[PDB]
């Protein structure tokens, strides 16, 4: 894995640094590493592919070394360099597509393809170069069991869970009470509704609560906390819990009284925020507890007093919402987010070559089913395949 | 290793060991060449001197 | 173009690496490239500007070489380096503003300013240095006709198109049927509405369909697909097709039954998703086909049954929506997105110096009119000017 | 500050470049800088911490130099390098946590901790290395008073201000007129409402206006301008200005007629946009002026004509909105945004060690109260602490 990143880093630098007319002192330390790579890789044969429609390709390396005698690199040197680089780039492309496609339940952090099991010897250890990308740094730090952090912009930590809860209900569905939520991507939109608007609740206050457990512990998260959840604020008809009948929801929106957002780690309150909106911070957490309440307004104009009678027919239902959007967060495990394209590369390779469903990953690489049951073996497989996807995304655009 | 005679220009900033360390494919010969390349004393102070 | 990136890369590195007190071995390979640059650029004169209010500046290069031998760089060397660097940075700033401002219908990929046509000789080819940024890598790969990819975070692939379609309509506008949509940035919000709620449709099911053709082929796109389009879910009054009269839209929201999202490339179904929300992936596509349908709920509580009569007056109109947001995508052509500022730099240079409207780009650099008719000559001009904008964004902050 | 970035850059590179089996020519220029660092740092003692619960640690440096005699780096060299690197990484971690925690009203741009005041001597100036990150580049450019630019993705330039304005009001609250807005993060959502729908306004047109002053001058901003503000488009009950009574708001949405978005710098119109939506650009501005108007529709179908009578009871209130979202912008001063995590690191260090509220920063590091009153001394403190946070975010993940 280290030597695969090293091959790709030298091929990236040798497409970048070895150009026409450049001075030799700019590339004097790269040509020695590329010659060490050629010297190491000669005499060896590899075999990539063999699963799904990924074709079996045989790789044989017989190349001459590059010259170390120019002052300015002329176009002859650039053309022979482009030939050797194009062959090695095709090789590492097929090794990365052979490694992202395989998985194992037993020990997923180990290389699974034959080519990367062959590259994991000490004969190939002199290929090794700097490990400067974030994924290979976290690979090398977790290979020695130290703390890592992946910085994500809007991480997909929440599985898709659009549902509700009726704390007070009946088959008439004309006096309901409870919460509704949308957990999607990095965004929680929650809305507790009461049809009576707390006309018989004690002190005209109805307490709502919504507890979101996470799968991995997020660290140093900037979170936009806004009131008035926008999706649960227009009238809609909703199927029941058993899916038998449908019930109508005509909301009018009160502001959330007494918002308490708590960030729990192992049941301990790490951060708490009482009636503070805008951008908040949560330093260390794996559970988000939103505690908002609906208070009946004690003074109402005649336009408002016709909405909430004391009797039964409520044509306008009180609804109170919050919105919580994790903008950026540092997570020790791998995830998906709106910035990288690594999950897209993994799914593109697994869908392009018509790959059968294996023992670990969900069918079709369903990220909702992958983050719903995010086991440590699936975590190891996901980190390995994302690291190889980062390597191929360095070489192949 | 059947190499060139190495026309070596008088006034090269690198000694012939310091470019035989990079022209030669072998490890062992070149490993000893690199020991000789940057062999130097440690500048030590023991007992004031 | 390669030598302009090389000038800017050396000036960036020589502002970074040549500092006070640093060791000479850290900068021993940069000073040789900077001296090669001084040796190449001496004796040459340039002329920048001359269009709009961009002033004509004459450039003459007569500088001494950085050959003093130091072990740690003292402040004398830093001050003379800062002088030479500030003159070259002003030169390359004015060359980049002279190149981003010009365009050509005939061959836009060629340099248009006099200074960059003069820098495109082989006398200046020994300036050349590593080409490591993404735009100069894709420039060098498309100069040899190989595959490229620009990675965008929320790409502006959709032109602004807020409109609707009435599949069933009359001048009374009290029983309507059809779709509405908002295509903006990277976001499609579509909503098909029926006023009758499929009370006379066969099997109480009304089929909607919305086909969005793209202008360039996106590759490996992560896409957040949510139901219940939020913008078309509140009551509004809307002008008619001819703009004569206005009609009222009072929506109640059903969930989308039988969502089928297809990703078409050349009419062939590449990816398909049947009733799956959350984050989806689309590996290769240039057309997005959303096929959702409205089904009348067969079991309704008395709060719902008063909304949808069998007769004509429908005060509550059934509406079903979807939202499709491309979070990140790899596109072979250049675009604009929410991450880079290159389009902002191009428009800032073209608006600061009061530049007349030329033959290629839209008046005022309208990105909606630029991506509406995204011709290959306009594509070549846009890629060239974005590459020069990336170069100037390296030097000028 | 320069030497602290230099220590962290060498420790980052020496975790990256000094690996097992790598060639010596890849690391031949890094080992000399790391040996210069060891030679400079020996014989010196430091003392970190001493405020809040940050513990006092004493630092003594007595290390031997690294060998310069290998051809391929073996595991002995890697293990002794990992020892020296882990000690220096712990040192620079505690120096950065000692510097981010302190502040001064008098001159905040100066180092405040004892360790960084000791590192600001010319004895430690030979530690210095390349300054390539964006924050240390802008630090070095503003240390010489040149122009800088921080590129932000969705900058938090707006303080949280959710409020309204009643241009026409009475204690009955049945015929109201005025604007409502949400300024949050990078997003302005504004909506002017009239209950009469301009039935007595001249030419049936009511002019709205919303002027947002900024705190710092943004430059080259890409801005998504959409109509129909989504948050102020559903019915809600709202407390009055004095908080005494509540009033009801039942909106129906017209489209915004005659949108004029102006970008003011020092009262001068820099950019203007008349009825153009989608992505717009604003090259230089510190005030955003939105001028939209509500026009009564002259032709209405019978479904619309029942909404707006000539008499007093208006059960459906005309409402017209806009949404303005700054996607990316270049600002000369430091800010917070959705991309970086530096504010999260600063707040995590200040909240982890239970730090008392000082003279400059708001209690609890309230970013709304920090950008509401964004004084230049607070600007200098914020830039210094963000630079140190960037340094620690390079070393500590
Ligand atoms: Zn983003």
TrEMBL record, chains A, C, D:
Family as reported in the entry's similarity comment: Belongs to the rotavirus VP6 family.
InterPro entries: Capsid_hemagglutn, Rotavirus_A/C_VP6, Virus_capsid_a-hlx_vir
Keyword Calcium: yes
Subunit structure: Homotrimer. Interacts with the inner capsid protein VP2. Interacts with the outer capsid glycoprotein VP7. Interacts with the outer capsid protein VP5*.
Entry comment on modification after translation: Sumoylated with SUMO1 and SUMO2. Sumoylation of viral proteins seems to have a positive role on viral replication.
Chain residues that bind Ca(2+): 266, 286
A cellular component term, taken from the record's GO annotations: viral intermediate capsid
GO molecular function: host cell surface receptor binding; metal ion binding; structural molecule activity
A Pfam family of this chain: Rota_Capsid_VP6
BP terms from Gene Ontology: fusion of virus membrane with host plasma membrane
Keyword Zinc recorded: yes
Name this protein carries in UniProt: Intermediate capsid protein VP6
Function comment: Intermediate capsid protein that self assembles to form an icosahedral capsid with a T=13 symmetry, which consists of 230 trimers of VP6, with channels at each of its five-fold vertices. This capsid constitutes the middle concentric layer of the viral mature particle. The innermost VP2 capsid and the intermediate VP6 capsid remain intact following cell entry to protect the dsRNA from degradation and to prevent unfavorable antiviral responses in the host cell during all the replication cycle of the virus.
Chain sites annotated for binding Zn(2+): 153
Other facts: The VP6 trimer contains a zinc ion located at the center of the molecule. The zinc ion is not essential for either trimerization or transcription activity of the DLP. Zinc-depleted VP6 has an increased sensitivity to proteases.
Compartments in which it is found: Virion
Domain of life: Viruses
Region (Interaction with the inner capsid protein VP2): 62-73
Key words of the record: Calcium, Capsid protein, Intermediate capsid protein, Metal-binding, Ubl conjugation, Virion, Zinc
From TrEMBL, chain B:
Species lineage: Viruses, Riboviria, Orthornavirae, Duplornaviricota, Resentoviricetes
Full protein stretch here: 442 to 490 of 882
Localization per record: Virion
UniProt remark on domains: The N-terminus binds RNA. It is necessary for encapsidation of VP1 and VP3. The N-termini of 10 VP2 molecules form a cylindrical hub underneath each 5-fold axis of the inner capsid.
Organism: Rotavirus A
The family this protein is said to belong to: Belongs to the rotavirus VP2 family.
Gene encoding the protein: VP2
Protein name as it appears in the record: Inner capsid protein VP2
Subunit structure: Homodecamer; each decamer is made up of two conformers of VP2, called VP2A and VP2B. Interacts with a VP1-VP3 complex. Interacts with the intermediate capsid protein VP6. Interacts with NSP5. Interacts (via N-terminus) with NSP2.
Record's comment on post-translational modification: Sumoylated with SUMO1 and SUMO2. Sumoylation of viral proteins seems to have a positive role on viral replication.
Function description: Inner capsid protein that self-assembles to form an icosahedral capsid with a T=2 symmetry, which consists of 120 copies of VP2, with channels at each of its five-fold vertices. This capsid constitutes the innermost concentric layer of the viral mature particle. It encapsidates the polymerase VP1, the capping enzyme VP3 and the genomic dsRNA, thereby defining the core.
């Amino acid at each position: 894995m280290d030597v695969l990143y090293s091959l790709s880093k030298t091929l990236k630098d040798a497409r970048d640094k070895i150009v026409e007319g450049t001075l030799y002192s700019n590339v004097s330390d790269l040509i020695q590493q590329f010659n060490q790579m050629i010297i190491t890789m000669n005499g060896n044969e590899f075999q990539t592919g063999g699963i799904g429609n990924l074709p079996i390709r045989n790789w044989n390396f017989n190349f001459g070394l590059l010259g170390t005698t120019l002052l300015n690199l002329d176009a002859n040197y650039v053309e022979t360099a482009r030939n050797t680089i194009d062959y090695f780039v095709d090789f590492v492309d097929n090794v990365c597509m052979d490694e992202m496609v395989r998985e194992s339940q037993r020990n997923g952090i180990a290389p699974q393809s034959d080519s990367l099991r062959k590259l994991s010897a000490i004969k190939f250890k002199r290929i090794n170069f700097d490990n400067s990308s974030e994924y290979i740094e976290n690979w090398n730090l977790q290979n020695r069991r130290q703390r890592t952090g992946f910085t994500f912009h809007k991480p997909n930590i929440f599985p898709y869970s659009a549902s509700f809860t009726l704390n007070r209900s009946q088959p008439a569905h004309d006096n309901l009470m409870g919460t509704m939520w949308l957990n999607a991507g990095s965004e929680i939109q929650v809305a507790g509704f009461d049809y009576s608007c707390a006309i018989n609740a004690p002190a005209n206050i109805q307490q709502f609560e919504h507890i979101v457990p996470l799968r991995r512990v997020l660290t140093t998260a900037t979170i936009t906390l806004l009131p008035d959840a926008e999706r649960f604020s227009f009238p809609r008809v909703i199927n029941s819990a058993d899916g038998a009948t449908t019930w109508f929801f005509n909301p009018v929106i009160l502001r959330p009284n007494n918002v308490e957002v708590e960030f729990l780690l192992n049941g301990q309150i790490i951060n708490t925020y009482q009636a503070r909106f805008g951008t908040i911070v949560a330093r260390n957490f794996d559970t988000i507890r939103l505690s908002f309440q609906l208070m009946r307004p004690p003074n109402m104009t005649p336009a408002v007093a016709v909405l909430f009678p004391n009797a039964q027919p409520f044509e306008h239902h009180a609804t109170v919402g919050l919105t919580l959007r994790i903008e950026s967060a540092v997570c020790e495990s791998v995830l998906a987010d709106a910035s990288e394209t690594l999950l897209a590369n993994v799914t593109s390779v697994r869908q392009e070559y018509a790959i059968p469903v294996g023992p670990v990953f969900p069918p079709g690489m369903n990220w909702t089913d992958l983050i719903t049951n995010y086991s440590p073996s699936r975590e190891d497989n996901l980190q390995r395949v994302f690291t190889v996807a980062s390597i191929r995304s360095m070489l192949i655009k | 290793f059947g190499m060139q005679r190495m026309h070596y220009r008088n006034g090269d900033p690198q000694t012939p060991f310091q470019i035989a360390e990079q022209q030669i494919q072998n490890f062992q010969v070149a490993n000893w060449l690199h020991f000789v390349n940057y062999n130097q004393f440690r500048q030590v102070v023991i007992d004031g001197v």
